Design a protein around this ligand. Structure first.
Ligand SMILES: C/C=C/Cn1cc(-c2cccc(C(=O)N(C)C)c2)c2cc[nH]c2c1=O
Length: 129
């Protein structure tokens, strides 16, 4: 299971060191509390936040960049929907998304390596089954 452990480790470091460090990103750190935003869950059908991404990483939900990026992109998509394309929340979520893509890009070689090797371990597991 250890290429998956290393992979999750890296994703988690992206979330804490890059995405959470975006200025004024605090609104995206945790699930919305309906007390503070009364309509959020009536408008937003698939909520997402950085704490949920971190909890998903620690459970090894993400085997590849694609499923990680799907949740990351969801944060920006919910913000366009709820706040509008030019809201300050959306600009902050766009920086969160943009710095995530950039970091994945800078780690592209090692991350392709890990992704391929998580798969090859998945297959060895099947050639047991
Ligand atoms: C899951 C993240 C969603 C991002 N988001 C958060 C808040 C917001 C504002 C103030 C407090 C909270 C909140 O519930 N906290 C900090 C727990 C969320 C907000 C207010 C208007 N639009 C938004 C918004 O798009």
């Amino acid at each position: 299971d250890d290429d998956q452990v290393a992979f999750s480790f890296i994703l988690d470091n992206i979330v804490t060191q890059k995405m959470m460090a975006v200025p004024d990103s605090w609104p995206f750190h945790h699930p919305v509390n309906k007390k503070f935003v009364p309509d959020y869950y009536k408008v937003i059908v698939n909520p997402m936040d950085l704490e949920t991404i971190r909890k998903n990483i620690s459970k090894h939900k993400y085997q590849s960049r694609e499923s990680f990026l799907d949740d990351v992109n969801l944060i920006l998509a919910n913000s366009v929907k709820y706040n509008g394309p030019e809201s300050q929340y959306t600009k902050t979520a766009q920086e969160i998304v943009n710095v995530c893509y950039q970091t994945l890009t800078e780690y592209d070689e090692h991350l392709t390596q890990l992704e391929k090797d998580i798969c090859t371990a998945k297959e060895a597991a099947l050639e047991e089954a």
